[PDB]
Design a binder for this molecule. Structure first.
Ligand code: 898
Lengths: 52, 230
């Protein structure tokens, strides 16, 4: 396994392979982090998070 | 839900409940954003007029009631086979997110198929029956359900499993969704984020041996859902 097939290409959420290199993205309400892999919530109550 | 565990504080915040004129739950839905609920099309036939309740875990102790402004049903749904069993509800007033009220994420199609639907399990939830012949549950419940190989699922089914559907649950172990859970959330967890992956659709009873729960395959309607919202 390579790129996206390897641990989601290290992405927090969406992993796509473009030009044979991982590109990560995030659902709406998240911003891709500086490292280009992690997803950061813009507000309170981002989608898909349990509210504990 | 038959089997499974109770949803604890803030564990199933995207759960929506469809209530008839008598404040009785008949179907679930999934919160997609402040104005939009996802549910099953077949649910739209089980009541003349209805409202949407969110933030509720115990239907006895007080939660926020929302009214429906627009009901957007998939034109190709047929009561005959339950294909295209999907609808989106736009509300009159925006949902206020808070503890226990929050939206589930919508994934991208390719990633969802290769990464979400290939996980071992998903989670279905709702206020439906705890036994096939029982009454509606007053507590919100959740249940971890394994993805079922597509081949096995078809072989197990007395009816046709189209490409807009998938199977989840257990061959014999007695846990399944059930009456009242329809329209509700099937979500799949990835690194602590939950994505909508299914809509509780139908089953040959509840928890019956050699049968599975049948869900509307959300990945097949992603664009439709986006268009429904925009
Ligand atoms: C699609 C197919 C079909 C087969 C069985 C059903 N049935 C028979 C009874 C059953 N009703 S129910 O208990 O409310 C739903 C139970 C579920 C178990 C697991 C689910 Cl996921 S949904 C149900 O949905 C159906 F509605 C539709 N066709 C005959 C219309």
């Amino acid at each position: 396994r390579k790129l996206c097939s390897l641990d989601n290409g290290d992405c927090d959420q969406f992993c796509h392979e473009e030009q044979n290199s991982v590109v990560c993205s995030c659902a709406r309400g998240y911003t891709l982090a500086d490292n280009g892999k992690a997803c950061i919530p813009t507000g309170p109550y981002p989608c898909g998070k349990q509210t504990l | 839900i038959v089997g499974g565990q109770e949803c604890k504080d803030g564990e199933c915040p995207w759960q929506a409940l469809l209530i008839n004129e008598e404040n009785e739950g008949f179907c679930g839905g999934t919160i997609l954003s402040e104005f939009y609920i996802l549910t099953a099309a077949h649910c739209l036939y089980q009541a003349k007029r209805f409202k949407v309740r969110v933030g509720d875990r115990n239907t006895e102790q007080e939660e926020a009631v929302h009214e429906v402004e627009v009901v957007i049903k998939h034109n190709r749904f047929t009561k005959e086979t339950y294909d295209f069993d999907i609808a989106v509800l736009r509300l009159k007033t925006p949902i206020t997110f808070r503890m226990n009220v929050a939206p589930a994420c919508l994934p991208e199609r390719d990633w969802a198929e290769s990464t979400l639907m290939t996980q071992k399990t998903g989670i279905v939830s709702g206020f439906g029956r705890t036994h096939e012949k029982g009454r509606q549950s007053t507590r919100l419940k959740m249940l971890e359900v394994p993805y079922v190989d597509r081949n096995s699922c078809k072989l197990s089914s007395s009816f046709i499993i189209t490409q807009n559907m998938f199977c989840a649950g257990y061959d014999t172990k007695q846990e399944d969704a059930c009456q009242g859970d329809s329209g509700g959330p099937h979500v799949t967890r990835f690194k602590d984020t939950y994505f909508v992956t299914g809509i509780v659709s139908w089953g040959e009873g509840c928890a019956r041996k050699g049968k599975y729960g049948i869900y509307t395959k959300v990945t097949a309607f992603l664009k439709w859902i986006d268009r429904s919202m925009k």
